[PDB]
Amino acid sequence: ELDDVHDPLLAITFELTLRSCLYPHIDKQYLDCCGNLMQTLKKDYRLV
């Protein structure tokens, strides 16, 4: 998944600024996951 994105990142300052573009992709996954889990706890076994 991510490796299958990081090799097209090679396909198209080198490994300094370009390397700091790799880190958003694993962040974008994480905000997808954490935002989902937060949904299914504040409702469905409501903490709040």
Swiss-Prot record:
Species the sequence originates in: Homo sapiens (Human)
Source domain of life: Eukaryota
Gene name linked to the record: TUBGCP5
Function: Component of the gamma-tubulin ring complex (gTuRC) which mediates microtubule nucleation. The gTuRC regulates the minus-end nucleation of alpha-beta tubulin heterodimers that grow into microtubule protafilaments, a critical step in centrosome duplication and spindle formation.
Tissue expr: Widely expressed, with highest levels in heart and skeletal muscle and moderate levels in brain.
Subunit structure of this chain's protein: Component of the gamma-tubulin ring complex (gTuRC) consisting of TUBGCP2, TUBGCP3, TUBGCP4, TUBGCP5 and TUBGCP6 and gamma-tubulin TUBG1 or TUBG2. TUBGCP2, TUBGCP3, TUBGCP4, TUBGCP5 and TUBGCP6 assemble in a 5:5:2:1:1 stoichiometry; each is associated with a gamma-tubulin, thereby arranging 14 gamma-tubulins in a helical manner. Gamma-tubulin at the first position is blocked by TUBGCP3 at the last position, allowing 13 protafilaments to grow into a microtubule.
Subcellular locations according to the entry: Cytoplasm, Cytoskeleton, Microtubule organizing center, Centrosome
Coiled-coil residue windows: none
Portion of the full sequence shown: 637 to 717 of 1024
Name listed for the protein in its UniProt record: Gamma-tubulin complex component 5
Record-stated family: Belongs to the TUBGCP family.
